[PDB]
């Protein structure tokens, strides 16, 4: 049995809508979650499905993988390519690849491949910044970490599924460009690069996270040690910069997109943690990293309410109203794979 079980059960009890097959945005159960965040809650369901050995929770979560998809398709349709936000398309392409791995349901591989191919085949460009995927498919003014590294990750899942080297080539070309043009080369991931004023070196949890995850995935697909080093350097930056003075990961609210970003960070830190624990690579860092992760999980869960819900401000919420994105990160932290 696990604290991850309790945390995921509580999350579903608080925020899941079995009628609309969608998460509520908050504990008042009034409006459903925003499109892209819903794909990140979809992945938390998947993470908890992989983490749990509770037979009731395992079967519920496996069903819920299908339900989340059906709720979203019922509202937004099956074809997300009319969404101007390439990031929206890619967060759901990545979720769909993972759903295929778990379920074997062909609809998910079609959704993943079709949506990924639309973004990468049409939104990759070498005229601005020597490479990279555009943020939007309407106006082309910026290329962003929050599309490019998720795209590398989606490509890696698609290579794992298909064994089509095209997807390894894509993952590698996207990551290589992103490391060059959206990082300092030393683990700091820049938000975006804009035509007018160039690189915007604002780092955040979710962009550290997708860079770490795509580097770990490239390490596993290629065996090239540089990708594991890239992940370690980005984890070091995260733990010394995106933390309070006590070492607890930051709160990036009140921005609605960022406030839940620890969810995506913790998901990807878990991949690095597992690779280093299992391989005995970077043993000094691995030990420090594991201690810091344990410390963060302990501090988050120390601030659970009586319903076992943890607000995303892990430094301290007594207002009675909890949000599903902000609250997700603590559940993710206890469901790492």
Author numbering: 38 to 353, 355 to 375
Manuscript excerpt for this entry:
In 2015 their 3D structure and putative catalytic itinerary were identified revealing ‐ in the case of the Bacillus circulans enzyme ‐ five enzyme subsites “‐3 to +2” (using the described nomenclature) with Asp124 acting as catalytic nucleophile and Asp125 as catalytic acid/base in a classic Koshland double‐displacement reaction. We used a more easily crystallizable variant, R341Q, designed to prevent formation of an intermolecular salt bridge due to crystal packing and allow ligand complex formation, but which is otherwise unchanged in catalytic machinery and efficiency.
In the case of GH76 α‐mannanases, not least because of the potential issues with S‐oligosaccharides described by Belz and colleagues, we chose to synthesise cyclophellitol di‐ and trisaccharides 1 and 2, respectively, and to render the latter less hydrolysable through the incorporation of a carba sugar moiety (as in 3). Having shown that a trisaccharide inhibitor would bind successfully when the enzyme was inactive for normal hydrolysis, we then sought to study the binding of the trisaccharide 3, which we postulated would be non‐hydrolysable by virtue of containing a central carbacycle, to both WT and, as a control, D125 N enzymes. As with reported complexes involving competitive inhibitors, interactions in the −3 and −2 subsites are mainly via hydrogen bonds with Trp172, Asn181, Asp228, Arg229, Asp239, and Tyr243. Our results thus prove our working hypothesis to bear out: effective mechanism‐based endoglycosidase inhibitors can be designed taking into account stabilization of internal glycosidic linkages through the employment of carbacyclic entities.
